[PDB]
Amino acid sequence: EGVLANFFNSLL
Amino acid sequence: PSEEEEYARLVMEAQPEWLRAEVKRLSHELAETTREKIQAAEYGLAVLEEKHQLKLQFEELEVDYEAIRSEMEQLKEA
Amino acid sequence: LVMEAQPEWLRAEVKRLSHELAETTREKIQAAEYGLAVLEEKHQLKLQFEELEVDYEAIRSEMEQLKE
Incomplete structure (x- = not known):
């Protein structure tokens, strides 16, 4: 689920 | 006065x-x-990855199941 | 001077x-909240995986039982 990983990386 | 207007007044008038x-x-x-x-x-990326691995492990088991089941069906002609 | 009025x-x-x-x-x-949703999703999928394992064993043993 690429939306979740993108959101997660955007917070790092 | 709500806590919000009381705080606003604090900031604009405190020392x-x-x-x-x-x-x-x-x-802090x-x-x-x-x-x-x-x-x-980080937690999210970890559990996202665990989920990904589990999905692959699953689909792998699906293929192994089909192979056996395919063979059995063929065998019920004997 | 008195920039101190700061x-x-x-x-x-x-x-x-x-802010x-x-x-x-x-x-x-x-x-x-997204982490919790993945955990929920992984839980459903783990349950489905263990179901398939059982059914897999069911028909691995039901064949092999095909024994002549």
Whole structure:
């Protein structure tokens, strides 16, 4: 689920 | 007065010693929450990955099941 | 001279940090609620995987039972 990983990386 | 207008009045009318302590207090609060935010995003990537591995492991088992089942069906002609 | 009349900068800092803290808390909560959703999803999928394992064993043993 690429939306979740993108959101997660955007917070790092 | 709500807590929000009481706080607004505090900031715009308190002395510098108070303003300096609030700046300090919020700086700790923001540093801690930034730490918790980062750990939450790492947790998410970890469980996202575990889920990904489990999905592959699953689809792999699906293929092995089909192979056996395919053979059995063929065998019920004997 | 007396740039010291500077509680306006402090006041600017209080409001800056207050806003950053609020958005960082939204991002943190949002992150946590997404983590929980993946756990829920992984739980459903683990249950389905163990179902397939059982059924897999069922028809591995039901063949092999095909024994002549």
